[PDB]
Amino acid sequence: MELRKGLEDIAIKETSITYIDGELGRLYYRGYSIFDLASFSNFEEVAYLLWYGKLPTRHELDDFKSRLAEERSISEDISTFVKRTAKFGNPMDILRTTVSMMGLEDRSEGDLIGKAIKMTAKIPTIISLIQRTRRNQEFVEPDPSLSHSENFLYMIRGERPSPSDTRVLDVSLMLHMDHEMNASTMACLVVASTLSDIYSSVVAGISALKGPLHGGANSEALKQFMEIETPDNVEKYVMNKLSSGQRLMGFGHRIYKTMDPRAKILKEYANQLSKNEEIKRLFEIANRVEEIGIKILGKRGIYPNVDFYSGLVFYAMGFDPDLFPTIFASARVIGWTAHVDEYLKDNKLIRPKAIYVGDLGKRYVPIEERLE
Amino acid sequence: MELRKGLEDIAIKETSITYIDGELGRLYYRGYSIFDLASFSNFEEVAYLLWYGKLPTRHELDDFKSRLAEERSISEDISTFVKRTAKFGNPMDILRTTVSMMGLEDRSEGDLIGKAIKMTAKIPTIISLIQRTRRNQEFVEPDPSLSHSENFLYMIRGERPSPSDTRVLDVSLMLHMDHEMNASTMACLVVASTLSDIYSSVVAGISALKGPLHGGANSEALKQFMEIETPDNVEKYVMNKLSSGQRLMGFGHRIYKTMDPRAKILKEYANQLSKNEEIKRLFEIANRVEEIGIKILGKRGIYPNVDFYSGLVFYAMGFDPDLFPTIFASARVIGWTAHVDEYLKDNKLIRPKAIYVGDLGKRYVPIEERL
Ligand SMILES: O=C([O-])CC(=O)C(=O)O
Ligand SMILES: O=C([O-])CC(=O)C(=O)O
């Protein structure tokens, strides 16, 4: 029988959650254009749409925003664990462990969406505590009067952010909430398919998202912009990379044959950030890298993906680069839990096989008869 | 493209680790019959075989046994977490968390098999601490002079086991070390395919193994023997279960269309367990349920699986029934990590598709216009 390794040409579910148009560079959440959501929506409204399948009324959104805000606090045992590990732990290992501890401590049955709301609310608190602890700063408690993105920036900086900063983060999070099928969604679904709990599913999603191949989930492009150091070095660096058969970071995608619509929106909204000398210089480098990259690689359907600008935007708003994968998980958890919820409406155990290519019927020999 | 919901009969890798013959009821690890390994081998020698692909020499096995014995200790952070949660937490949630903590505490690069050795050595220390804490008993530290299975029972009981009890645990663990492809192996491989670390892979395996649909990692057959209560009540209990649309627990397999060879080996080795009155009774019940269940369900290719006897065997050696899935994982981590190691020799990112059946091109309706 045929080996289908990678599963690239196999669908494992029907979905109404996300639609990717790789041809035209379009992305839809439940039929709504990502462009319109970036323009007019906000984190809580899109989270509501992804989980409940419709845009909320004024009343539904006010109640929903309150629910999220009163779930933001974390248990003292989780908070102590983060404080203890923040300086030396891989932050994805910290986040993986704390979501595992959340599930251990929540024994209550069913309520998949209630549990997803709890993880979504608490992950920014955990990330903020890692960042603060790393800088020898005291924990800033969540403020239940602030909206999700506003509160996120408050917990990192210890001061209420400008509405323009809130908007850029709010948009960046909306852009990472779902992207249909990929290794991390597949890990959540394989675990859900056994009727394991939703915390187990998310822990598996975080385990997969951590890997460097996952796509989208890194700060390599930003590292590259820092290596280049000056705008005038862009050409020398990019040519010496490509000619040397090396890769331009933040370029390429398995689906978009064009500019990633998420990269396009991040580049536009990145203009609202006030930039010191360092950030101004890094954005000038990124824009030149973008131009020469598209000139050489665009022919072959190799274009900026979301991670070309995402790392630099998060860095610009005051996040350490090695937290970027955790910030990705804080958004994508909505997509993961939405996909599990949809799958479980008609559950099927995911139970593939393997092709055997070894030996059979070998004769067991005791250890005294094994030579050398 | 093709919708293959459940990936039934989709092959996702090539393997030389494990072969299952569902028609004849046979199983092989690296070409060796499970019957021969159960007759003549031991936990460390089979772990060596699964990881390194051949039977070790005396020198290779002495070194490997040391490497395993030297890694059994757990961090103060892990032992304190286990002690805090042993009486309250789901034991698979505790294991999931403590393997996650192992990963966090090990920031070394590469050495997949070294990290597999660390997880395989430490998991029994965690299981034993859960069990001891539940019984208001003091932690028993691993003894590096004892073999894996000897140590395991020592950490549970606080006294060195008999060689007969050691052999039964040794065989029972070997029988769970690998079973080719299933949801837990698949969860491990999906995570490994991104080049995430081997602890991340195993955390995902444990997360999948916890689910009641996984197969093999449950105590439902033992619970059913305990509900039956007397050997005389077997015919009536089973006939009334099967006539009311319910299942005989520990019967049925997606692959074996005969007696699971792991069930046949556990039944034979269970004879060497010295049994108190309860365990004698439960085994009499189990042997009658087997006889009866084969009579009724056999013609339909429904036979005992490994989990018909496994829960009862682990219970008879002094483990609480609800630790059984952790014990399953303590052996199966060898298979998982061996499968990951094999896969990564020619890695391919696992990135399936979905069929979109939803709405497209909807107008964003401003909130003041909604219902
Ligand atoms: O889906 C992918 O290929 C990876 C990705 O871009 C994402 O997770 O957003
Ligand atoms: O493989 C399966 O189908 C379940 C099982 O029996 C095992 O994992 O040992």
XYZ file of N, CA, C and O and ligand atoms in Angstrom, chain A residues 20 175-176 178-182 184 209 214-217 253-256 260 262 306 328 332, ligand 1:
101
model
N -8.316 29.564 3.600
C -7.110 30.182 2.998
C -7.231 30.124 1.477
O -7.396 29.049 0.930
N -4.628 38.436 13.822
C -3.990 37.843 12.624
C -3.471 36.427 12.908
O -3.269 35.719 11.910
N -3.208 36.056 14.178
C -2.592 34.757 14.544
C -3.636 33.787 15.119
O -3.267 32.660 15.451
N -6.171 31.912 13.890
C -6.336 30.601 13.210
C -5.689 30.651 11.841
O -5.647 31.740 11.172
N -5.220 29.488 11.412
C -4.777 29.325 10.015
C -5.066 27.905 9.522
O -4.222 27.355 8.842
N -6.259 27.396 9.814
C -6.801 26.132 9.253
C -5.871 25.018 9.759
O -5.512 25.019 11.009
N -5.433 24.142 8.865
C -4.713 22.895 9.235
C -3.193 23.088 9.117
O -2.703 23.713 8.142
N -2.468 22.577 10.097
C -0.987 22.634 10.180
C -0.562 21.708 11.323
O -1.452 21.118 11.976
N 0.396 22.094 14.344
C -0.048 22.339 15.733
C -1.541 22.036 15.851
O -1.944 21.444 16.882
N 3.934 23.657 18.298
C 4.186 25.071 17.848
C 5.629 25.485 18.170
O 6.185 26.303 17.450
N 7.678 24.655 12.353
C 6.187 24.626 12.367
C 5.707 25.577 11.262
O 4.736 25.196 10.498
N 6.415 26.710 11.149
C 6.062 27.859 10.292
C 5.372 28.949 11.103
O 4.545 28.615 12.002
N 5.703 30.219 10.846
C 4.977 31.367 11.431
C 5.484 31.747 12.817
O 5.407 32.960 13.159
N 6.007 30.774 13.575
C 6.092 30.786 15.061
C 7.506 31.101 15.534
O 7.915 30.387 16.448
N 6.068 30.270 2.120
C 4.864 29.689 2.774
C 4.388 28.480 1.957
O 4.456 28.512 0.703
N 3.871 27.470 2.650
C 3.390 26.207 2.029
C 2.123 26.511 1.207
O 1.884 25.768 0.231
N 1.377 27.592 1.513
C 0.065 27.896 0.847
C 0.095 29.204 0.030
O -0.328 29.150 -1.151
N 0.478 30.353 0.600
C 0.412 31.653 -0.130
C 1.458 31.652 -1.257
O 2.649 31.455 -0.958
N 1.615 37.210 2.021
C 0.718 36.689 3.082
C -0.183 37.864 3.480
O 0.335 38.923 3.814
N -1.702 38.469 6.105
C -1.321 38.820 7.489
C -0.068 39.691 7.469
O -0.037 40.606 8.294
N 3.955 35.962 7.486
C 3.514 36.726 8.682
C 4.726 36.966 9.593
O 4.765 38.018 10.260
N 2.305 34.074 20.007
C 1.633 33.317 18.931
C 0.650 32.334 19.576
O -0.528 32.311 19.210
N -3.339 31.730 18.929
C -3.685 30.509 18.168
C -4.506 29.535 19.025
O -5.195 28.678 18.431
O -0.269 27.058 8.657
C 0.976 27.093 8.431
O 1.545 26.630 7.394
C 1.850 27.761 9.475
C 1.314 29.126 9.719
O 1.490 29.948 8.834
C 0.606 29.431 10.805
O 0.500 28.612 11.714
O 0.034 30.522 10.865
